[PDB]
Design a protein around this ligand. Structure first.
Ligand SMILES: [Co+2]
Ligand SMILES: [Co+2]
Ligand SMILES: [Co+2]
Ligand SMILES: [Co+2]
Ligand SMILES: [Mg+2]
Lengths: 189, 186
C-alpha cells in the first residue's frame, strides 16, 4: 500500500456495465425496426405534444430504430404524479440494490406519502419499507460497501446496532476479517 | 392505447436513478474529506502514471473531495486480467439484474474462461452460471420486461420452453393476460 497523487491516476477505461447497456439498447432497437414497439410507452400531454413518463429504454430504442410513430397511452399527470411514477417504476426493476430501494422509499415519503401507500404502490409490507429506510442512517462508506456486495444487508443491520461513532470501526472489522453477520453482531461491546 | 408520432414525444426529464447516484457520490465525497478512503484504490502502471483498476466511485468521490493523494495498491495487470477483474467486481454488486449477470458471465467465457472457472471466480455453482446464460437466447423485448420487473426469472424460463417463433407471443400473453409462472408454462 502506497500514497499516490490523484493527478497521476487516470480513470478506469473498462466500463462493462455501460457497454452492456449500449449493446442491449442496440439489440432492442434492431428488433423493433422490424416489428415496431413491443409494449406501449407511457406519456403525458405537454405543450404542442407529449412528455415521456415511463419506458425510457423503449423510447430511446424506438428512436435508434428510426421509427416515425409509436404506440402510446396519454394520461394527464401533474409533475408530482409523474415523479411518483418515475420513482415507482424504478423501485420495481430487477436492478434495485437495497440502498437505492431505501432512497426511493424516502423520496416517496418526502413527497407526502406514507409507508403504507409506499408499500402498496410497490407491493411490500410496511415493515419492509421501514427496515429499508433505516439503512440511510449508515455512513456513506458502509452503504458503498453494501452496493459493492462486500457486505450484506445483514451486516448493515448489525452496524446499525453499533453507536454511530463506532460504525466505521465496525465496518473495517467486518471487511478485514470477512466476518459473518453473526460475528458482526458480536462486535457490540 | 393509441398510436402517435414519436417526434411529438419528448424525453423524460425525471431521472431519479441518476439523481440518486449524484447525491450519494457527493455524500461519499463529503465523507472522504473527513475520513479519507476506507479502502485503497487498486491501480496498475499506465503511460507516465497509473490507471484505475477497481473502485471507480471511491476514485471520483476522492477527486470531488479535493484530495491530492490517496492510498492505493499497485499491481502489474495485463489488459486481460484488468478486464476480468472489472467484470468480476461488477458481478459481485447488489446492483445487477439477472440479465446483466448473464452478460457478465458470457463476457468471461469469451475471454477464454470456462463455465467452471467463471463459477469459481464469482462464488456460484456451475449450474447457476449455465442457467443464467440461457436467458440470453430470449428475444430483446422479453429481457427488457425482465429488467423492468414486469416478469420474473420464472416467466423467462417458461418462455425458453416455447419455440423461438412463439416467444414474443408468449411474452404478450403473460403481460396482457397477467398470468403467473405456473400459468405461463403452457
Ligand atoms: Co467507499
Ligand atoms: Co442478508
Ligand atoms: Co428526478
Ligand atoms: Co437484487
Ligand atoms: Mg388523475
Amino acid at each position: 500500500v502506497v500514497r499516490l497523487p490523484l493527478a497521476s491516476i487516470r480513470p478506469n477505461p473498462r466500463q462493462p456495465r455501460k457497454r452492456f447497456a449500449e449493446e442491449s439498447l442496440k439489440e432492442l432497437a434492431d428488433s423493433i425496426r422490424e416489428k415496431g414497439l413491443l409494449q406501449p410507452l407511457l406519456v403525458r400531454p405537454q405543450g404542442d405534444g407529449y412528455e415521456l413518463v415511463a419506458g425510457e429504454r423503449r423510447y430511446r430504442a424506438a428512436l435508434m430504430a428510426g421509427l416515425q410513430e409509436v404506440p402510446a397511452v396519454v394520461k394527464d399527470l401533474t409533475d408530482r404524479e409523474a415523479l411518483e411514477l418515475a420513482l415507482v417504476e424504478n423501485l420495481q426493476r430487477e436492478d434495485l440494490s437495497p440502498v437505492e430501494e431505501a432512497r426511493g422509499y424516502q423520496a416517496l415519503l418526502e413527497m407526502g406519502l406514507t409507508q403504507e401507500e409506499v408499500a402498496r404502490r410497490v407491493g411490500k409490507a410496511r415493515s419492509t419499507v421501514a427496515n429499508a429506510l433505516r439503512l440511510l442512517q449508515l455512513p456513506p462508506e458502509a452503504l458503498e460497501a453494501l452496493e459493492r456486495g462486500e457486505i450484506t444487508a445483514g451486516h448493515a443491520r448489525a452496524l446499525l446496532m453499533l453507536e454511530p461513532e463506532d460504525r466505521l470501526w465496525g465496518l473495517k472489522e467486518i471487511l478485514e476479517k470477512g466476518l459473518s453477520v453473526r460475528q458482526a453482531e458480536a462486535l457490540r461491546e
